Design an enzyme around this catalytic site. Structure first.
Site, PDB file in Angstrom:
ATOM      1  N   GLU A  11       0.777  -1.212   0.000  1.00 51.08           N
ATOM      2  CA  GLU A  11       0.000   0.000   0.000  1.00 51.08           C
ATOM      3  C   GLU A  11       0.814   1.270   0.000  1.00 51.08           C
ATOM      4  O   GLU A  11       0.330   2.289  -0.427  1.00 51.08           O
ATOM      5  CB  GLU A  11      -0.891   0.030   1.252  1.00 51.08           C
ATOM      6  N   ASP A  20      -6.381   6.758  -4.609  1.00 48.63           N
ATOM      7  CA  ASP A  20      -5.921   5.417  -4.796  1.00 48.63           C
ATOM      8  C   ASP A  20      -5.970   5.013  -6.283  1.00 48.63           C
ATOM      9  O   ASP A  20      -6.371   5.797  -7.130  1.00 48.63           O
ATOM     10  CB  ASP A  20      -6.650   4.492  -3.810  1.00 48.63           C
ATOM     11  N   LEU A  32      -8.876   3.885   3.159  1.00 46.36           N
ATOM     12  CA  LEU A  32      -9.872   4.544   2.309  1.00 46.36           C
ATOM     13  C   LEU A  32     -10.737   5.556   3.082  1.00 46.36           C
ATOM     14  O   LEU A  32     -11.262   5.276   4.159  1.00 46.36           O
ATOM     15  CB  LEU A  32     -10.773   3.552   1.598  1.00 46.36           C
ATOM     16  N   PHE A 104      -8.291  -6.608   3.383  1.00 49.40           N
ATOM     17  CA  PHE A 104      -7.955  -5.226   3.637  1.00 49.40           C
ATOM     18  C   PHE A 104      -8.148  -4.366   2.358  1.00 49.40           C
ATOM     19  O   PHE A 104      -8.606  -3.260   2.375  1.00 49.40           O
ATOM     20  CB  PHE A 104      -6.473  -5.255   3.988  1.00 49.40           C
ATOM     21  N   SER A 117     -12.716 -19.756  -5.828  1.00 45.06           N
ATOM     22  CA  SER A 117     -11.338 -19.673  -5.353  1.00 45.06           C
ATOM     23  C   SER A 117     -11.268 -20.080  -3.888  1.00 45.06           C
ATOM     24  O   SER A 117     -10.290 -20.670  -3.468  1.00 45.06           O
ATOM     25  CB  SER A 117     -10.788 -18.269  -5.400  1.00 45.06           C
ATOM     26  N   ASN A 132      -7.416 -19.626 -10.863  1.00 47.69           N
ATOM     27  CA  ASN A 132      -8.776 -19.038 -10.776  1.00 47.69           C
ATOM     28  C   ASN A 132      -8.739 -17.604 -10.251  1.00 47.69           C
ATOM     29  O   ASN A 132      -9.477 -16.735 -10.703  1.00 47.69           O
ATOM     30  CB  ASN A 132      -9.678 -19.861  -9.813  1.00 47.69           C
TER      31      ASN A 132
END
Length: 164
Positions: A11, A20, A32, A104, A117, A132
């Protein structure tokens, strides 16, 4: 390597409001603020989150505090979710960090949508799940980060980050 170092690599750290990859207003370590187009809405959310008038800028300490909250909320969220919990329970420690990373970034809801998945990870079909997971908007939008996470699920090691 641990969850915090991993997410800090993916990040980044920014002390001023920024946009972002998706164009949303963010601050610190991927925190965020709002999906709203208004820098004003963003700044308001920011002060609410910090408890001060920040005027779009925070300290390192504030960034880390938000980061601590976010990681905690991510873990608690997985543990409370009927779809994610069983997957989390089934995984080894490293792979657990990989799922936390996804949650996250994309929220509980978003990861919970990777039905097939999740099933493959639960069954420990590593290679199949990696293939996948790559068939997603996630992968197409942020390929280098998605690749790192995917490699982590694939191998069960921190190789993808030992570079970085």
């Amino acid at each position: 390597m641990n969850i915090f170092e991993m997410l800090r690599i993916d990040e980044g750290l920014r002390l001023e409001i920024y946009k972002d990859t998706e164009g949303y207003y963010t601050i610190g370590i991927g925190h965020l603020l709002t999906k709203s187009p208004s820098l004003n809405a963003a700044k308001s959310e920011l002060d609410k989150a910090i408890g001060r008038n920040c005027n779009g800028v925070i300290t390192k300490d504030e960034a880390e505090k938000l980061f601590n909250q976010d990681v905690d909320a991510a873990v608690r969220g997985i543990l409370r979710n009927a779809k994610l919990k069983p997957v989390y329970d089934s995984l080894d420690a490293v792979r657990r960090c990989a799922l936390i990373n996804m949650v996250f970034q994309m929220g509980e809801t978003g990861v919970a949508g990777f039905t097939n998945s999740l099933r493959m990870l639960q069954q420990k079909r590593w290679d199949e799940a990696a293939v996948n997971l790559a068939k997603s908007r996630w992968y197409n939008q942020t390929p280098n980060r998605a690749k790192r996470v995917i490699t982590t699920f694939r191998t069960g090691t921190w190789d993808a980050y030992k570079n970085l």
